[PDB]
């Protein structure tokens, strides 16, 4: 999309977030992700992926990868090898783990 595109923008949509949904607007706002200020449906500012039905211990960056491993923010922040592993893809374990 054309707006959200600062985490703090991101983080002013979740003034009306339900506080009894079990993820935070941080954790969302951060992973990309604004409120669209209906139940607990949130949509990425750069790839426009939609999530809802947050559950406890979700990883909004996980579900990011999960759902649009082509998004390109997420690529930027995440980079490619952490979404490779999110789809199941594991050439490059070893110098993953050693890297960080
Ligand atoms: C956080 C986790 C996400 N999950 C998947 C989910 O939310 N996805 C996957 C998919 C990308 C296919 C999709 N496409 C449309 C919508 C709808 C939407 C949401 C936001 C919005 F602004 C406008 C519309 C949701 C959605 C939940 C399980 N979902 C719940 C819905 O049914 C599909 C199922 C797999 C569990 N929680
Ligand atoms: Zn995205």
């Given at each position: 999309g054309s707006?959200?595109?600062?985490?703090?923008?991101?983080?002013?949509?979740?003034?009306?977030w339900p506080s009894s949904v079990p993820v935070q607007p941080?954790?969302?706002?951060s992973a990309?992700?604004?409120?669209?200020g209906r139940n607990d449906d949130v949509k990425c500012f750069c790839c426009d992926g939609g999530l809802r039905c947050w559950?406890?211990?979700?990883?909004?960056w996980v579900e990011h990868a999960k759902?649009?491993?082509?998004?390109?923010?997420?690529?930027?922040?995440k980079?490619?090898?952490f979404?490779?592993?999110?789809?199941?893809?594991?050439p490059h374990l070893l110098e993953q783990l050693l890297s960080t």
């Open positions: 707006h959200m595109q600062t985490h703090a923008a991101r983080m002013r949509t979740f003034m009306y941080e954790q969302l706002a990309g992700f604004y409120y669209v559950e406890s211990g979700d990883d909004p759902w649009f491993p082509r998004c390109e923010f997420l690529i930027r922040m980079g490619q090898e979404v490779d592993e999110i789809q199941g893809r594991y």
